């Protein structure tokens, strides 16, 4: 995900997960930062992971509005 970058150590790459540039690639990519995604490197898989990341009844007066939504009945408040 980072410029197809090279890392010479596993402790270091494990430190890449919390970094300025790494989070810039994520967040600017549309994949929000922090701890859920702190594993996988490839740009693709975290896109489906981020896709994985991201009704009431207000009773009108005719006794038929028991199917009617809250906001809908409020709209009929503005109409009434």
């Amino acid at each position: 995900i980072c410029s197809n970058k090279v890392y010479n150590g596993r402790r270091t790459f494990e430190r890449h997960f919390n970094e300025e540039r790494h989070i810039y690639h994520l967040r600017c990519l549309g994949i929000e930062p922090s701890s859920v995604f702190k594993g996988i490197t490839k740009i693709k898989e975290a896109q489906e992971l981020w896709k994985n990341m991201q009704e009431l009844e207000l009773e009108e007066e005719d006794e038929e509005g028991n199917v009617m939504s809250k906001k809908v009945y409020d709209e009929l408040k503005k109409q009434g």
């Binding site: 701890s35 859920v36 702190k38 594993g39 996988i40 490839k42 898989e45 489906e48 992971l49 994985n52």
Partner: protein, 211 residues
């Protein structure tokens, strides 16, 4: 060998799964157990060739301090360990039973807290002791000396609070000379926060008697 991105999608808490969980013989199951309601992760000092306990923290560990209740019994003076007894039997029994009946160590530990190698409870215990005692609206003598802030004088951020407002996180803080009478600027205080039976209440408390 399913990639962790594949493996983190199955799980209701994807932030537990780690690079190595992918390689388990049955990851699908491990990932589901590991994310089960109350299971606690394996202690983390595996993969460390250090042998769990190795020095760097352990060089500086303090020898031992007797609990305060016991220290009341005066033994610390009779037998000097660092670097005949005339003890009284009724006094000793009461310490464990009558007086120290309900005494429980200050912090202990909770359900999920394993002990990792570098952790030190002596800090953590003080930090609870600190938060309960320290407070907004009062400044200790020690800090006053350091600040050069005599008792009865408003602290130096007073002017800025008149300009910018009271603390964003203390809506009920009253400060003398701002939103509390200036006569409350007294001693070490300059401000103040100013906003059962549980079915089994025992209603009587009686310890086992020695005599």
């Amino acid at each position: 060998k399913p990639s962790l991105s594949q493996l983190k999608s199955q799980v209701p808490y994807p932030q537990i799964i780690e690079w190595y969980d992918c390689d388990a013989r049955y990851p699908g199951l491990l990932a589901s157990i590991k994310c089960t309601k109350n299971v606690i992760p394996v202690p983390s000092h595996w993969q460390s060739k250090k042998e769990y306990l190795s020095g760097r923290s352990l060089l500086g560990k303090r020898p031992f301090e007797l609990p305060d209740i016991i220290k009341k019994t005066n033994i610390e003076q009779m037998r000097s360990t660092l670097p005949a007894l005339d003890l009284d039997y009724k006094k000793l029994h009461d310490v464990f039973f009558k007086i120290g009946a309900n005494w429980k160590p200050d912090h202990l530990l909770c359900f999920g807290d394993v002990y990792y190698e570098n952790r030190n409870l002596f800090e953590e215990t003080n930090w609870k002791r600190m938060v309960d005692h320290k407070r907004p609206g009062r400044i200790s003598q020690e800090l006053r000396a350091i600040m050069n802030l005599p008792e009865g004088q408003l602290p130096p951020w007073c002017m800025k609070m008149k300009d910018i407002g009271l603390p964003t996180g203390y809506p009920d803080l009253k400060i003398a000379g701002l939103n509390w009478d200036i006569t409350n600027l007294k001693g070490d205080v300059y401000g103040k926060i100013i906003p059962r039976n549980y079915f089994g209440a025992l209603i009587s408390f009686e310890t086992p008697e020695f005599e």
